[PDB]
Amino acid sequence: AAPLPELLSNNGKHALMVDGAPYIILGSQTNNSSNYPDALKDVWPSMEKMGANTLSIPVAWEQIEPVEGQFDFSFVDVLLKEARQRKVRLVLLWFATWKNNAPHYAPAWVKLDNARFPRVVKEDGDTLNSLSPLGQNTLAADKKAFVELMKYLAKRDKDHTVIMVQVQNEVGTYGAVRDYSPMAQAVFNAAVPDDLIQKLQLKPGTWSQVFGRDADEFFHAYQIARYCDEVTVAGKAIKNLPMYVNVALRNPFNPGLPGQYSSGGGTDNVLHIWKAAAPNIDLIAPDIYFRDYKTVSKVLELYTRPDNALFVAEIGNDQPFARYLFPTLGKGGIGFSPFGMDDTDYTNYPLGAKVYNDETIEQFAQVYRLVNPMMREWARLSYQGQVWGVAEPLDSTTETQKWNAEATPEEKEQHKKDRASALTQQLDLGLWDAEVTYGRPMFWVTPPEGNTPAAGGALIAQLDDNEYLVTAYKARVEFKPSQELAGKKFMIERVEEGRFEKGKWVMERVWNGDQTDWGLNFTDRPHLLRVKMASYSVQ
Ligand code: NA
Ligand code: NA
Ligand code: NA
Ligand code: NA
């Protein structure tokens, strides 16, 4: 019997174990209305073209329990069989009490019965279409259906085609910070639970007393976290798969107010509340639709924690997003799942690609082709060792920035110098450093000008003190000594291009001469290198 998938966390590192070894989700995620047998023919070709190893796809409460007590797993049966035929794995997305803050995917007998399953009430007494996490009947009903889905996987998915489940989808509330219903006010205007007071090491009191100006938001996050933890515990008691929640992000630099962003989700200001309230939820995953490097880089920093494995549970499917695979994996990320990878005639532009076509898919296939050939080796190095990864750090030049034209000719040479500097990244690899640059020839040392559009990146894993696994894309990687060498010289000892067969390295060729004189130059094609550096005495 195949071992259960498990999220391992050790010495601040994390692995998603699948079939007893670390695994990387090189994902594809459907649009929101592809969770039906007839839609699957519009999902698989994209997944094949992408080279994805894992499909993220919804399972909706409305579809599995359309009449109370009358369960229907017909979709899950077809999805399992067709995934198995393609030798891919699944992440099921439980669309239930919350889907983007709302109950649209709850059955009609739930979402149309507000007295049994109550909505968030604003301070002014107006109601929002967002179920209250203090609704005890709604918690019992969600938990009961979730348990029936997990019983379906316990009985029908013994080899764990499904490796992980997302509990709810982008929880929270737009339009208000919390529930201000009478039922919610009786809990708010009362003692904070001792367990939270103890975990945050705070002094006992009421929500307002203990949290002050943050009481309303922290209250909603705590109550939603508890609700999602209870659904999670109930499901894991049936089959103990990894389970996670996906966050409708607030802007980490300039968030605005809770309710403008989805209040109560796992936003960066309430990760402490979520971790204290929901010990059974494996990780809190960001849904990334910010296109600019600085903001995305900040999200990856905030969500990668000693207590939080990094899973990019959604990302935009426009071209600029593909290169974020590199920093995601460099952070020890367990996966990456671009959203909207199907041909069901929908695009979420402006969040994603304006057009969905083979070119849209190819931007992701090209970076997946760097990782797929080493996926198990990379996953093990990421968990047990030292890895790094970078993306091209300037976004594509805007029409408003092309401003460049109105610049004097000295402002221009200075711009070119400034861009070359910004397109040059340093990595400290112990005894050796790497310098990664973007958008230059494969010969000579003309400064980097960037790729058009921005697209490059690099992955490095340490194999030994002087040996690295390297693959990169539309970039140059150069090695150098990390520390002054006291009389010694240094060189590349050997660069081998090759592959892993049955976990053994197979060399195909040695890079040397022009291929190593000017750093290690990558285009759009996949090359996996083993780089051995040496210092040597000359005296
Ligand atoms: Na990892
Ligand atoms: Na060093
Ligand atoms: Na150094
Ligand atoms: Na090769």
Residue numbers in the entry: 36 to 437, 439 to 575
What do the authors say?
GM1-Gangliosidosis and Morquio B disease are two manifestations of mutations on the GLB1 gene that encodes the vital lysosomal β-galactosidase. This enzyme is responsible for removal of a β-galactosyl residue from the non-reducing end of its substrate, converting gangliosides GM1 and GA1 into GM2 and GA2, respectively. Based on X-ray crystallographic studies of compounds 1, 14, 16, 17 as well as 22 and 31 in complex with Cellvibrio japonicus β-galactosidase (CjGH35), a tractable bacterial model which shows around 27% sequence identity with the human enzyme, notably conserved active centers, intensities of inhibition and chaperoning properties, may be partially rationalized. For the inhibitors studied here, the ligand sugar moieties have clear density in all the active sites and overlay with ring C atoms 2 to 5 in similar positions.
Ligand 31 is identical to 17 apart from lacking a hydroxyl group at C-2, the importance of which is reflected in a much poorer Ki value (200-fold worse for human lysosomal β-galactosidase). The active site residues are similarly oriented in all of the structures, with slight differences for 31. There are two other differences in the ligand interactions of 31 (not only from those seen for 17, but also from the other complexes studied here). Firstly, there is a hydrogen bond from the C-3 hydroxyl to ND2 Asn204, in addition to the three hydrogen bonds to Asn67, Lys134 and a water molecule (which is hydrogen bonded to OD1 Asn204 and OE1 Gln64). Secondly, there is a shift in the position of Gln64, with the NE2 atom forming a hydrogen bond to O Ala348, instead of the OE1 interacting with a water which is hydrogen bonded between O Thr65 and ND2 Asn67 (as seen in the other structures). These probably play a far lesser contribution to the weaker Ki values than the absence of three potential hydrogen bonds from a C-2-OH group. The importance of this interaction is clearly seen in comparing the Ki value of the GH35 bovine β-galactosidase with 17 and 31. These inhibitors differ only in the presence of the hydroxyl group at that position, and indeed 31 binds some 20 fold less tightly, corresponding to an approximate 2 kcal/mol difference. An even bigger 200 fold affinity difference is seen for the human lysosomal β-galactosidase (GH35), implying crucial interactions of this particular hydroxyl group with GH35 enzymes. The corresponding deoxy derivative 31 exhibited distinctly reduced chaperoning activity and was only trailed by deoxyfluoro analog 37. For the cyclopentanoid chaperones, on the other hand, OH-2 appears to be a vital feature for their activity as inhibitors and pharmacological chaperones, since its absence and the concomitantly increased basicity of the adjacent amine apparently cannot compensate for the reduced number of interactions with amino acid residues resulting from the removal of this particularly crucial functional group.
